[PDB]
Amino acid sequence: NMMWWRGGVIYQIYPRSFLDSRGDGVGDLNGITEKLDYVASLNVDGIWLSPFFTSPMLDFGYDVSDYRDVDPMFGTLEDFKALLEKAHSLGLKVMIDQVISHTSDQHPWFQESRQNRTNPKADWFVWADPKPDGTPPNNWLSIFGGSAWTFDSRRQQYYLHNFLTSQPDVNFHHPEARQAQLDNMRFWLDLGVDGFRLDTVNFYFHDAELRDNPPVPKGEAKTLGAPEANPYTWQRHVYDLSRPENLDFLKDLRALMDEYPGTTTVGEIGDDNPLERMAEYTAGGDKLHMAYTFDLLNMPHSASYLREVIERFQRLAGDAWPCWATSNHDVVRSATRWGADEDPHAYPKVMLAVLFSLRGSVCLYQGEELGLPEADVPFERIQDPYGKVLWPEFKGRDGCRTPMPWTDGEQGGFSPVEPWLPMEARHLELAVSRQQDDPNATLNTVRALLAFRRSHPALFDGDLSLVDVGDDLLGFTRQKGDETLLCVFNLTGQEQQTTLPVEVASDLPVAHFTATRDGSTLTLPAYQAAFMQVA
Template sequence: MDPHASSVPVEPAHPALRGLKWWQRGIIYQIYPRSFMDANGDGVGDLRGITSRLDYLASLGIAAIWLSPIFPSPMADFGYDVADYTGVDPLFGSLADFDALLEAAHARGLHVLLDLVPNHTSDQHPWFLEARSSRDNPKRDWYVWADPKENGRRPNNWLSFFGGPAWTLDEASGQYYLHQFLPQQPELNWRNPEVRAAIADAMRFWLDRGVDGFRVDVIWLLGKDEALRDEPINPDFRPGMPPHHQLLHPYTQDLPETHRYIAEMRALLDEYSARGRERTMVGEIYLPFERLVTYYGSAEAPECHMPFNFILTQTGWDARKIRAQADRYDALVGEGWPNWVLGNHDQPRVLSRFGREQARVATTLLLTLRGTPTVYYGDEIGMADVDIPPERVQDPAGLRQPGVKAASRDPERTPMQWSDADFAGFSTREPWLPLAEDYRTVNVALQDRDPNSLLNYFRALTRLRAVTPELVAGAYHSLEAGFDDVFVYTRSLEVGTVLVALNFGGAARTLHLPGLGAAGSVLLSSVRREGEVPLEALELAPHEALVVRLR
């Protein structure tokens, strides 16, 4: 296979979109490999399983799939503890299976992004095994080590995201090593140029195989305070919040040198893009908008193509609040390219947060705001969080923080619901996590046959997006709707203007939108209406999402 050959289209058909890259025009679909499709019958999803479902993925009208980590790992954090950056864990298959997936995806016009985890490795990675073998080992400085304080206490007060201190004592050497997640996930020292070179080599390994880019895990944590100063107490901490929130984090998050590290990674991707196939980098960053947008970098030193915008995962389902956030974000992005996400492997599912009645409204919001949408597997059919019995909890974040509500991420990671067959068509045996009780009525096979299903509404939206350049490249402008539970905005290009009206509530609303013309043509409605609608008295049904072309 020629890793640089692909049938992935380079240029869109519509002239209005020809200045945009594929990752600006398209939709990204996140796959959690353990839970997508099991081809070998061991109860865990794998690469061959994903390959077997590529026709389904292509039918969704997406541009790319993003795979959560598939690298060799002891699976202490289900792959986010990497033991080898240039391989595939046998649980998921082999490098040959990956190459076959990549080739088959490209043949269908789908790009493939991998989840890169450069902040930390597994404690079983050969690098760390060497580093901890002695204080004078050449790889010792590849990780963050510190001596105990005089009384043997930890070097400082830093905390782990998963509960407890961020330091573990290596008794053999008498020093502590840093881990902001599990003790089995020691942190790399990004000040060391050899570390950065090694990660760059790992990126090249996958780029040479033909991957189209990376989603980079916890990218805003790469820099750490060299003096290892204590972090200040958070005055807003309250009981019930995750213990990590006890502190503010100026010395472990969003440090100035992090931007230099990311710029180096971006330069490598740009080298590959210059060869003719555009590569992209999405950075996982949980920061306020004002800080988030700095991770686009500058013209002289570009950074992430898209710093992940998680605001919709952190804002309640409130039309006015979401409008305010969308307005603010759109204004702050500037020359950067926006992006939106409603759910992922770390957040409760959309349906569980907003309710089944609002599923079409949420889908429409995600796919019509300005910027690249990222969809989490199963959201297109309305999968919900699953109650996991205590004895079946797998997630270390939940196991280590039993008193913290929603600490476990298992509920949103359950197997994809393909059919009403045993084990939801995901596997031929009991899956690694419990199935949703509703899988016999909420599944792909059933919804595929139903023209009124959420799945087919999702497809209708992606088809509309593909032929409506305003929804991809158009400017965003919000309008005053006159109701607290309605969000209205336009997407405009020289070729025209499209209006999006979203009813977040269960009551019918009549909107008065002067200045837009007398009437518009319905492009799509979640209540299946067609034809023209008056704009000065625009009626919205309860829970309706409506997309209208203005004259």
């Protein structure tokens, strides 16, 4: 089953906030291992672990100082090997973040590189002379605030960092640096991991000519990957990322993956035109296997919007393959971001039915299966550096990173001490223990939906054809071989009725959804999904 990834459903675990088995208030690897039975019970096909590598934690793991080891607060490399073995014993694939665009400034490569202009690693990061006036080489901005360039007195040069000052970007124009990153990835492949989530995958190359970005014209939409309050959104990102050279590197990376049959990659795209970049990066069978974008990670969420995304994607490369996600550790939890003005119990169920019915692979974020709302983290508990630069207009990402509620008890059973981010009180009522045996809880809707998805080949990788069910319903067929299903979703809080545009052979009940069909007339109460076998 070497193509499991092309349609598979992956559960994203954010290790710091999953389960603290050790007792310091931070989630760790043994905590994950303890809960792998729960993960398998979701009927997902695998997991993706956010970073657990040695890190000063200034960007909570995305600032890596040793690519081939586990940070002591998460445990050890043997703990990882044990996690991997247990996941495999349960039939789960294990993917891990690879953060190859940048290192921590505490990474030995950077410690060496920064000493002078002449050392063996001088060119492994992106160094440039100041302008004659002493200022940065160009107008590029860090996503986390200020110039993307920081001066280092040792070299009398600036280095580039798209993110924190402590996250210097690796110079992909330097072949030895690219190869060192591939070798780091091979280390994990040799341990038996099933694949990688590639952080900021389109960022790897910058323009060697260091050209200024043009401004975004007034009245034009801002990028989907950053809050509008961020100055980063005032530029069109043409020279700082998404450069042609990256396509060739993706081929080298794919060649590595191809040496390990059954392994996969999902790239994180952060681009002004993200569907286009995802299609380009995942086409040709010789680059990324799949990638996700911020198209479904932002504010719009109507049936019309979703149709628009699908229509746009269906004009792009026919050999592209998307991974769809509605939540992750970088954005407001979907139950709030999309569902704040909808019924808090019913809406996440139909939203997830949609996610699980789109043509593509799926990433499901920890806690999204519980219908968890965004947490409200008080100012004095804020941890994310991205929550301390644009406050209060943008409050960072801590609200989606609060600890998982295993129980309704003290700290939700997450830790014996006060956790690194506060347990959200509302989450206790929605805890795993509270949903486990409630057939009406979102947890069990998810289990049922994913069991249903598994039972229909059309819902793994079938073609998708939009059908006309009116403006306020989302409807499409999914087809693989002899199976054609009609899928219709009412994402609204009001009943909708439509004539069906295709002939239906039978109804397919799932997960306590309650749509009524009388011949060609389909009635969908608020927040209901309907699946039918097409004649």
